[PDB]
Structure 1
Amino acid sequence: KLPPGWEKAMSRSSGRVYYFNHITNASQWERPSGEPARVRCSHLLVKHSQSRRPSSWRQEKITRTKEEALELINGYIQKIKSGEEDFESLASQFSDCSSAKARGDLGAFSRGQMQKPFEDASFALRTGEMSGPVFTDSGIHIILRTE
């Protein structure tokens, strides 16, 4: 019926159908369009107090709650989707990963190298697509598949 991981849902506020991906946490109104050895992705990471390493180049001691980190991620996604901000600009300013210095770019990678939820979301994205919030032991990620 639909590409890997997609399902139909109904908007609670408007009653219109939309589509949700349970691997990437992406959601969109339009029906999703019609696997490679490697993908290339960028990401924006927001760490929280239960992150494997609660520290980053932005903050020596990361104290925000996981719920707070999700609110921040959700707000970045809103501004990317509206065009008020670019993904690369937000990643450079606010990602708790040191890849922030490369506008979030991680380069190319294969299966078995990244943390599993990150890997699964990366490979389920189509080229150019963005994930919703993706949870790993590092924190919460927004993932952009660039190749």
Structure 2
Amino acid sequence: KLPPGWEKAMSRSSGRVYYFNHITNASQWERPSGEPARVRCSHLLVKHSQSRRPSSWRQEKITRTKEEALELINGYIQKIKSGEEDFESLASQFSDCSSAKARGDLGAFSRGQMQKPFEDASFALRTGEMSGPVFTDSGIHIILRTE
């Protein structure tokens, strides 16, 4: 039927079908379009108090809860999707990863390099697509596949 990970769902508020991807946590109204050895991704990480390393270049001790991090991630996605703000503008300013200085770019990578939830989301994204919140031991990511 649909590309890897995609499924139909019903909107609770509107009643229109939409599409949801249980690997990338992407969701969208439109039916998804149509694996490589490597992909290239950028990401925006929001760390929290249960992150493996509760520290980042933004904050020496990161104290926010997982739920507060998820709300930050959700707001960033809203601003990206609405075009009020660009993915790399937000990554540069707010990602708790050192790759913020590279606009969130992590470069090319193969399978078996990144943490598994990140890897799987990255390889299920089509070029140009963005994930929803992706949970790993580092925190919560928004992932943009650039190549």
Q: TM above 0.5, one fold?
A: yes
Q: 2 CA distance for matches of 1:33 and 1:48? A: 34
Structure 1 position 126, deviation (Å): 0.1
TM-score (norm 1): 1.00
Q: 2 CA distance for matches of 1:34 and 1:110? A: 23
- 1:107-146 CA-to-partner distances (Å, cap 9, x unmatched) read 0000000000000000000000000000000000000000
Matched residue, 2:79: 79
* SS of equivalent residue, structure 1 residue 59: coil
Q: 1 CA distance for matches of 2:3 and 2:107? A: 25
Q: 2 CA distance for matches of 1:97 and 1:108? A: 16
Structure 1 position 92, deviation (Å): 0.1
Work out the percentage of aligned pairs sharing the same amino acid.
Answer: 100
Unaligned runs of 5+ in 1: none
Q: 2 CA distance for matches of 1:132 and 1:139? A: 13
State the aligned residue count: 147
Q: 1 CA distance for matches of 2:25 and 2:50? A: 21
Structure 1 position 101, deviation (Å): 0.2
Unaligned runs of 5+ in 2: none
Structure 1 position 34, deviation (Å): 1.2
Q: 1 CA distance for matches of 2:74 and 2:94? A: 13
* SS of equivalent residue, structure 1 residue 34: coil
CA RMSD of aligned residues (A): 0.3
Structure 1 position 67, deviation (Å): 0.2
Structure 1 position 66, deviation (Å): 0.1
Structure 1 position 19, deviation (Å): 0.3
* SS of equivalent residue, structure 2 residue 33: coil
